[PDB]
Amino acid sequence: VMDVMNRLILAMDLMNRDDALRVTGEVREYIDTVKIGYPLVLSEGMDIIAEFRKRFGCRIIADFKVADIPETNEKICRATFKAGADAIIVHGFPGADSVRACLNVAEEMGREVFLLTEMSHPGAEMFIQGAADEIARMGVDLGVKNYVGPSTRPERLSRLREIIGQDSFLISPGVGAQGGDPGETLRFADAAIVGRSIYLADNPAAAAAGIIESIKDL
Amino acid sequence: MDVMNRLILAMDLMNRDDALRVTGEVREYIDTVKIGYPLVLSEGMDIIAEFRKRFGCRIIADFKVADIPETNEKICRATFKAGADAIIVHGFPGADSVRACLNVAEEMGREVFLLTEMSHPGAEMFIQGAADEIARMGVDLGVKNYVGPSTRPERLSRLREIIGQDSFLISPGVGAQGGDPGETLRFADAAIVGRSIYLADNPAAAAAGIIESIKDL
Numbered sequence A: 001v002m003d004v005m006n007r008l009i010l011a012m013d014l015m016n017r018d019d020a021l022r023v024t025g026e027v028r029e030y031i032d033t034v035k036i037g038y039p040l041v042l043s044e045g046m047d048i049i050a051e052f053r054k055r056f057g058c059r060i061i062a063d064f065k066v067a068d069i070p071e072t073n074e075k076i077c078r079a080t081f082k083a084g085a086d087a088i089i090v091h092g093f094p095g096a097d098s099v100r101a102c103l104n105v106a107e108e109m110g111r112e113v114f115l116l117t118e119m120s121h122p123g124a125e126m127f128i129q130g131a132a133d134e135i136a137r138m139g140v141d142l143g144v145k146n147y148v149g150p151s152t153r154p155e156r157l158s159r160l161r162e163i164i165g166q167d168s169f170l171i172s173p174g175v176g177a178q179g180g181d182p183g184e185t186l187r188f189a190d191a192a193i194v195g196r197s198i199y200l201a202d203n204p205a206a207a208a209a210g211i212i213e214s215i216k217d218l
Numbered sequence B: 001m002d003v004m005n006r007l008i009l010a011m012d013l014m015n016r017d018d019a020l021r022v023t024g025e026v027r028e029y030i031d032t033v034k035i036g037y038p039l040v041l042s043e044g045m046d047i048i049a050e051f052r053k054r055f056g057c058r059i060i061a062d063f064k065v066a067d068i069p070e071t072n073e074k075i076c077r078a079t080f081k082a083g084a085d086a087i088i089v090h091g092f093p094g095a096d097s098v099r100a101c102l103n104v105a106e107e108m109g110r111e112v113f114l115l116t117e118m119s120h121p122g123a124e125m126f127i128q129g130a131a132d133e134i135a136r137m138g139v140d141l142g143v144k145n146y147v148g149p150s151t152r153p154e155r156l157s158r159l160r161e162i163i164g165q166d167s168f169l170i171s172p173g174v175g176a177q178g179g180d181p182g183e184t185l186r187f188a189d190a191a192i193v194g195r196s197i198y199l200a201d202n203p204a205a206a207a208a209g210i211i212e213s214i215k216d217l
């Protein structure tokens, strides 16, 4: 599995190139894995991935929550990996064929797919939660090795970890701003995803250091 | 929304030159283009303004927004700043995520399209069973624009029943995926067509032919 420094992944959702670069650089010594999503990509373009690679020694996870038909998912993955992304996050709710499409491109292109099972926000309880266990099982059957689960629901994150097994890699968002606790999250997830708690702080570096200091024994 | 010839072009080519050429080749048949991630992630968001400058067509950003409320807001804002007239949002992530999109749409004078059931085989696993409930949620939220599957006319009909004849419904899966344009239009206000047109030896003749088959509609 990817070696995530300090088990901490930065969710860089700032929408300004200068601010995104400044903050990421300020926490460079604490994090070597950055999750870049559409807020930043749709604001600065896919070239932002290249810029981050040039400026920092950071791994890039493209959080595009791919959720289209197989044919379109394939094109999205190809474009994303072509841009230099190490991994891409895909939704499992659209079904096995849509996930397989992403897995095939990742295999062909030598990159990785992360399967988003349950989400961390309140609305996830409406439809996603009830399908989450099956989505995770589907991922295991498809050979998925990387997963995303909610830090906001410990009991659910724990169940997801059980389904995918100790060997699978699991990252979890919802830490900090959404209420998730770093330590408790890491009882099940390999790495915690943190956005606002870090990028909106007066001193991102101190915020990151604080989170890391709280999970030092872990 | 007034879609010319009840035909929306799904421009999923990933080359600026080809995308622009093909769209221009069928411009006389349409005035509504659906631009998705295949083109946007390959050529950038500036492509939307370019289409408006060259064709004046209305643009539907098919981004199947499916994140938490806070991120959805940012995605819609970035998308509408680029000049999109509407954005397609997944209903599966729940009401709060849809509401976030509705808020930005209202603020920037744009429209939100709610995707309720998808057209591919995999949609049967999880989406289909929640589709009716997702459509009702859309009604409860005041959503007026919807997306339903051409590949399952009975499901497209049920969606129309739920949202009413007043709501606007567009439907993909026509052509390449097996959907019939005429049957699709019995329920949807407009049919979305991609490959059957942009991969045709002659895109214009392909579009003309589709329109020819639905001229009585």
Ligand SMILES: O=C1CC(=O)N([C@@H]2O[C@H](COP(=O)(O)O)[C@@H](O)[C@H]2O)C(=O)N1
Residues within 6 Å of the ligand: A011, A013, A037, A063, A116, A118, A119, A120, A121, A148, A149, A150, A173, A174, A175, A176, A177, A178, A193, A194, A195, A196, A197, B067, B068, B071
């Ligand atoms: O269930 C999920 C999935 C996900 O990717 N995310 C993303 O994780 C990040 C969370 O950031 P934040 O720490 O709440 O500011 C954002 O980029 C979200 O889009 C989430 O919050 N919930």
Ligand SMILES: O=C1CC(=O)N([C@@H]2O[C@H](COP(=O)(O)O)[C@@H](O)[C@H]2O)C(=O)N1
Residues within 6 Å of the ligand: A068, A069, A072, B010, B012, B036, B062, B115, B117, B118, B119, B120, B147, B148, B149, B172, B173, B174, B175, B176, B177, B192, B193, B194, B195, B196
């Ligand atoms: O259920 C759905 C939703 C959707 O937007 N689409 C999109 O509609 C278009 C269909 O294109 P095509 O006519 O099959 O080539 C693509 O851009 C798809 O991503 C779909 O095919 N099914």
